[PDB]
Structures are given as structure tokens and as C-alpha cells.
């Protein structure tokens with residue numbers, strides 16, 4: 001039984017001022033490097049224990065002992081994502097009901113049905129890049145976010161955001177981005193009722209109303225038309241949970257759609273951006289991935305079966321998720337009093353946060369070369385130890401979107417490598433912006449067309 005380490009304190013504010021940074025995950029990784037596998041983080045009114053080792057994270061991932069917790073940021077995201085799958089407690093009726101309804105819509109088999117819509121948006125990205133002039137460059141996270149938002153709009157509810165036709169966001173997206181920023185900023189406030197935050201609060205309520213009004217109209221329009229498109233909205237209007245025998249109600253459908261738009265905007269685009277960063281910094285890897293794309297993608301339009309054959313492109317994406325897991329943390333609570341790792345006693349209800357970038361740097365698992373980008377670590381999936389690699393979370397509360405995200409990212413990266421050579425023309429220095437997720441801010445490249453028709 002040991003006392004855990006704790007970072008530097010600020011008197012009556014305890015550790016709370018350490019949250020006052022626009023790069024809080026990267027700040028917490030540096031604290032983990034200094035203090036080790038576990039540290040306590042105290043604020044007036046709450047405590048979190050941050051975990052970084054596979055030894056302790058494997059225990060936290062035992063669903064008989066620990067369940068998903070809503071961290072302060074997820075409690076504030078719940079003001080607009082409601083009891084959708086991401087912001088519900090496991091014990092709320094709507095979690096298991098929506099999980100049972102939606103699981104078949106997110107299976108590997110379901111990807112055959114979404115493939116043609118994903119190809120529509122991927123072709124729009126390739127055509128944008130083919131149409132650039134010699135003196136221009138690509139704004140990577142900006143174009144990846146256009147692509148992933150547009151893909152989930154078309155597969156989620158047959159709606160075209162038309163992100164390649166504008167420089168200014170859709171009204172929904174201005175509101176969603178601003179609401180996510182407010183939710184991510186609320187936990188660092190020592191006095192949330194300070195009148196300095198009144199304008200923030202008015203704008204938050206306004207942004208929630210914009211998102212609710214727009215998605216409620218989409219749902220009401222589809223129910224009126226009777227149209228049966230092969231999207232997630234049709235599946236949610238027609239599905240019934242085998243356990244309760246009930247369908248989702250229109251309020252819960254709205255929260256699921258909001259949740260899917262947050263994920264499409266924030267997560268897959270980060271993965272694609274980090275993958276392209278590591279490829280231009282590691283040209284032997286780029287060559288090996290480009291050789292696979294050329295040999296496999298032999299038709300002007302990729303097929304589902306060809307995307308499945310992009311093994312090395314998949315290894316590149318896993319190694320990008322290892323170093324920069326774009327959703328970089330998840331929270332657990334102790335179901336009962338217990339002892340973590342034979343050393344750290346916990347009370348029922350105690351909150352834990354898993355720092356996924358530190359799990360993925362645990363040299364007791366990955367061996368000594370953890371900061372190197374080496375997709376060959378994933379060449380044989382049976383070589384990865386249990387609970388060492390967790391970019392999609394854990395157990396029944398793991399990412400429902402994992403197969404969707406990896407099919408979209410494999411298709412897009414494969415087409416990018418088939419159609420272009422890439423140049424890091426600025427010698428870009430990695431700068432990681434934090435929203436809900438991690439992305440490489442200011443990352444630019446030049447493409448040179450291989451002149452292969454679509």
C-alpha cells in the first residue's frame with residue numbers, strides 16, 4: 001500500500017490551474033513522464049487518478065471491477081449529445097437499447113453498404129487535389145475534416161454538407177464547434193458562476209438550440225417523406241431493440257445523430273492527418289504503402305474487397321493511432337471498494353482517467369523503440385499483447401464506429417497514395433491542437449499528381 005504522487009499545487013485551488021492551458025492532454029503526458037504510472041489530480045470538489053502503465057490499465061479495463069465514467073468534459077458534452085451512446089451511463093435504459101439497435105449498422109458487413117457513399121466523398125477530395133495549380137499547397141487537417149464530416153453526413157442521414165464547395169462552415173458546424181469548445185473549457189473554471197462567463201452561457205444555449213432545431217427538422221422531414229435510404233437514420237427509424245422490444249424515440253435519434261457528427265468531424269480526420277504526417281516524415285514507409293496502393297487499387301473506383309486487401313495501409317493507420325491516439329483518454333469509476341495493482345486502495349465511485357498516449361509508450365510492452373514510427377510492429381496482429389493498444393477504448397463501451405472509421409481511413413489513404421506523390425515542402429514542425437481530439441495544426445504538403453485517371 002503506497003501514497004500516489006501528485007503534481008504541483010496552487011494553494012486552495014490544488015491542481016486546478018494546471019488545466020488552464022490549450023494543450024491539456026500534452027501537459028498531462030509530461031506530468032505522467034515525471035511522476036510515473038499513476039498520479040492523483042485534485043481540484044476543489046473532485047479528484048481524478050491518471051493511469052499510464054499497461055499493468056494498471058489492464059486492471060482498470062476489467063468490467064467486473066470498473067465501468068465507464070462521464071468525465072467533467074463528457075458531462076458538459078451531454079448538454080447537447082444527451083443520452084446518445086457516447087454520453088450515456090451503461091446503466092441508463094437508452095444505452096443498451098441504442099447499442100443493440102445500432103450494432104448491426106456498424107459491423108464490418110454493414111461497411112459494404114456505406115462503401116459507395118464513402119467513395120463519392122473520397123473522389124471529391126482526389127479531384128480537389130488534382131485541380132490545384134503548381135504554386136499551391138494542401139491544408140491537411142482542413143481537407144481531412146471536410147472529407148470525414150461529409151462522409152458521416154451522407155452515411156448518417158443522406159445530407160450533403162458540401163464542404164468542398166465552401167470556405168465557411170455550415171451553421172450547424174459553427175454551433176457544434178463552438179459548443180465543443182465551451183464544454184472543453186468549463187472544467188478549468190474555479191468560479192463557474194462568475195458574471196465573466198454570462199456571455200459564454202448565453203452563446204452555449206444558442207448553439208444547442210441551433211443544433212436541436214436543425215437535426216429535429218431532418219428527422220421530421222424523413223418521417224414525413226417515407227423515403228427508405230440506406231443510412232443510419234433509416235435504420236434508427238425502423239429498428240427495434242430485441243430486449244425491450246422498443247424503437248428509439250425521436251429525441252434519442254437526434255442525440256445519436258449529433259454524436260455521429262461530432263465523431264465524424266473530430267476523430268477520423270485527426271487519424272488521417274497524423275498518418276499523412278508520419279508518411280512524409282518517413283519516406284521508406286511512404287514508398288511501401290504507395291507500392292501496396294498501386295498493386296491493389298487497380299480500378300478507377302476502389303471496391304470494398306480491394307480496401308480489405310490494403311494490409312500495410314492498415315498497419316500505417318494503427319501505428320499513427322499508437323503514437324497519437326486522436327481520442328486520447330477515457331474515464332472509469334470503481335464499481336466497489338477495491339485495490340488497484342495491489343498498492344493503491346480505491347473507494348466505490350473513485351474516478352480514473354486512462355492516458356492512451358502514455359499506455360502506447362509503455363516500454364515494458366512495446367520494448368525500447370516506442371517513439372519511432374514503425375508500422376511493421378503491427379505486421380502480425382498476434383504479436384500485440386492484450387490491453388497494450390486501446391485507441392478505440394475498452395469492452396462494451398468501446399467505439400461503435402471503429403470499423404466505419406478504419407474503412408473510411410483505409411480507402412482515403414489508399415486513394416491518396418495511388419494518385420499523388422507528397423512533399424513536406426516546409427519541413428513542418430509538429431504542433432498538436434486539442435479540441436475533443438488531437439490534430440496536427442498548420443500541417444501543409446504539396447502533392448504531385450501521378451496522372452492516373454478516375
Ligand code: HEM
Nearest residue numbers: 085086260263267268271327330392393397399400401405
Ligand atoms: C479514428 C477514429 C475514432 C477513434 C480513435 C474513436 C475513439 C473512441 C473511443 C476512445 C471511444 C470510447 C470513449 C470512452 O470510453 O469515453 C469511442 C466511443 C464511441 N465512438 Fe468513436 N472513435 C472514432 C471514430 C468514430 C466514428 C466515426 C463514430 C461514428 C460515426 C464513432 C462513434 C462512437 C460512439 C457512438 C461511441 C460510444 C460507444 C458506446 O459507449 O456505446 N467513433 N470512440
Ligand SMILES: CCCCCCCCCC(=O)N[C@H]1CCOC1=O
Nearest residue numbers: 024025071072073187327328329436
Ligand atoms: C473522446 C476524447 C475525450 C478526451 C478527453 C480529454 C480530457 C483531458 C483533460 C482531462 O482529463 N480533464 C478532466 C479534468 C476534469 O474533467 C475532465 O474531463
